[PDB]
């Protein structure tokens, strides 16, 4: 998937060999789907003002590269929580979680009032990968189109391993005739 990964990186990069970082803590990247950082995840007043009903923490954990939240954190707020203890490394098999994450986003959006924040530490690699996979798996977008729409609404940069996993997913969905031409 080297060529395919490189094609995706070419859509993300700034043409100096660099990738823009997020200019805001949180963005609505497609209708009722928000991607954001640790700061917004831990700011319940802000979440309530955006009308967030569901939070998917794609960086759950105790290190400086994780967000140390849990169901308890959200208990009084009426927000439904799911955590995935992912690491942002090329070796981490985030694709094992694509179904679970896509199901959680579907659970949130199935009711018309639902709004989901999918967040990680920076809203840059882990959480955008899960949103892109959801758009592919549930909205029949090919990876290039899905990545492009998310990148138009938030500066993202999934690590090359995550991008390879998305390319593998795209191959499978395209093969099975589940993507829109």
DSSP code per residue over 142-162 = -HHHHHHHHHHHS-----HHH
Q: Do 127 and 95 form a contact (C-beta atoms < 8 A)?
A: no
Alpha-carbon distance 73 to 63, whole Å?
Answer: 17
Q: Do 101 and 33 form a contact (C-beta atoms < 8 A)?
A: no
Domains of the chain, start order? 3-181 (3.90.190.10)
CB count within 10 Å of CB 142 equals 16
What is the sign of the dihedral through the CA atoms of 30, 138, 130 and 7?
negative
Backbone φ, ψ for residue 26 (5° rounding) = -150, 140
Alpha-carbon distance 100 to 104, whole Å?
Answer: 6
The two structure tokens encoding residue 38: 């640790």
Backbone φ, ψ for residue 33 (5° rounding) = -120, 115
Measured in angstroms, the resolution is 1.9
Alpha-carbon distance 125 to 113, whole Å?
Answer: 27
Q: What number of residues does the chain have?
A: 181
Alpha-carbon distance 143 to 12, whole Å?
Answer: 13
Active-site residue, 120 included: yes
* Maximal C-alpha separation, the chain: 48
Q: Which residues pair with residue 78 across a beta bridge?
A: none
Q: Where are the beta strands (DSSP E) in the chain?
A: 26-30, 33-36, 54-57, 80-83, 116-119
First to last CA, the chain: 21
Enclosing H/E stretch for 108: helix 98-109
Q: Do 157 and 120 form a contact (C-beta atoms < 8 A)?
A: no
- The one catalytic residue in 18, 26, 120, 167 is 120
Alpha-carbon distance 158 to 9, whole Å?
Answer: 9
Q: Do 129 and 166 form a contact (C-beta atoms < 8 A)?
A: yes
Alpha-carbon distance 93 to 23, whole Å?
Answer: 28
Backbone φ, ψ for residue 57 (5° rounding) = -90, 105
The two structure tokens encoding residue 49: 């003002």
């Amino acid at each position: 998937f080297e060529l395919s990964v490189q094609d995706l990186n070419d859509l993300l990069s700034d043409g100096s060999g660099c990738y823009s970082l997020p200019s805001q803590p949180c963005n609505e990247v497609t209708p009722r789907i928000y991607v954001g950082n640790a700061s917004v995840a831990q700011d319940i007043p802000k979440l309530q003002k955006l009308g967030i009903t569901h939070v998917l923490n794609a960086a759950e954990g105790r290190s400086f590269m994780h967000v140390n939240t849990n169901a308890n954190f959200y208990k009084d707020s009426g927000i439904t929580y799911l955590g995935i203890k992912a690491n942002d490394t090329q070796e981490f098999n985030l694709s094992a979680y694509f179904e679970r994450a896509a199901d959680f986003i579907d659970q949130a959006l199935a009711q018309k009032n639902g709004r989901v924040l999918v967040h990680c530490r920076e809203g840059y690699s882990r959480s955008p990968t899960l949103v892109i996979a959801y758009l592919m798996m549930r909205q029949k977008m090919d990876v290039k189109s899905a990545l492009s729409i998310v990148r138009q609404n938030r500066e993202i940069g999934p690590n090359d391993g995550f991008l390879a996993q998305l390319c593998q997913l795209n191959d499978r969905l395209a093969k099975e005739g589940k993507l829109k031409p």
